[PDB]
């Protein structure tokens, strides 16, 4: 999880910065 | 956005499959 | 034999390539 | 000059490398 957790976290941050919408997030939460 | 949207979507899907938690998602929603 | 981390790496690279990642970027990465 | 897509590509590659992406994986990607 270290490397995995770090990858997930940095990916999420980049995604948000790229403009990932609240709608995408909400959809993700429903999965 | 095509390529960008497609990248975001596929990245999210992979993230979820890797075990991205509800807690991470919720944190993301608060940003 | 394939961990969650490896699988995520694989999928991420695939998505990167599809998005148009260039050979140059790949070359630079190799130089790291 | 750097689009959101390019920037995301850059950050994703950086994160991939940090996670331990191998040279072999990079070689294979180049062969695509």
Swiss-Prot record, chains C, D:
Post-translation changes? Ubiquitinated in s SPOP-dependent manner; leading to prteasomal degradation.
Q: Its domain of life?
A: Eukaryota
Q: Which residues form the HNF-p1 domain?
A: 1-32
Q: What happens when the gene is disrupted?
A: Mice are born at less than half of the expected frequency. Neonates are slightly smaller than normal and do not grow normally. After 5 weeks mice weigh only 50 to 60% as much as their littermates. Mice develop non-insulin-dependent diabetes mellitus (NIDDM) 2 weeks after birth. Mice exhibit elevated levels of blood glucose, combined with reduced blood levels of insulin and insulin-like growth factor I (IGFI). Males and females are sterile.
Positions of region (Dimerization): 1-31
Compartment(s) where it occurs, according to its Swiss-Prot or TrEMBL record: Nucleus
- Tissue-by-tissue expression: Liver.
Q: Which family does it belong to?
A: Belongs to the HNF1 homeobox family.
Q: What does this protein do?
A: Transcriptional activator that regulates the tissue specific expression of multiple genes, especially in pancreatic islet cells and in liver. Binds to the inverted palindrome 5'-GTTAATNATTAAC-3'. Activates the transcription of CYP1A2, CYP2E1 and CYP3A11.
Q: How does it assemble?
A: Binds DNA as a dimer. Heterotetramer with PCBD1; formed by a dimer of dimers. Interacts with PCBD1. Interacts with BHLHE41. Interacts with NR5A2. Interacts with SPOP; this interaction promotes ubiquitination and degradation of HNF1A.
User: What name appears for this protein in its UniProt entry?
Assistant: Hepatocyte nuclear factor 1-alpha
Q: Which organism is it from?
A: Mus musculus
Supply the gene name.
Answer: Hnf1a
Location of this fragment in the whole protein: 1 to 32 of 628
């Amino acid at each position: 999880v270290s490397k995995l957790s770090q990858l997930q976290t940095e990916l999420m941050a980049a995604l948000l910065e790229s403009g990932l919408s609240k709608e995408a997030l909400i959809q993700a939460l429903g999965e």
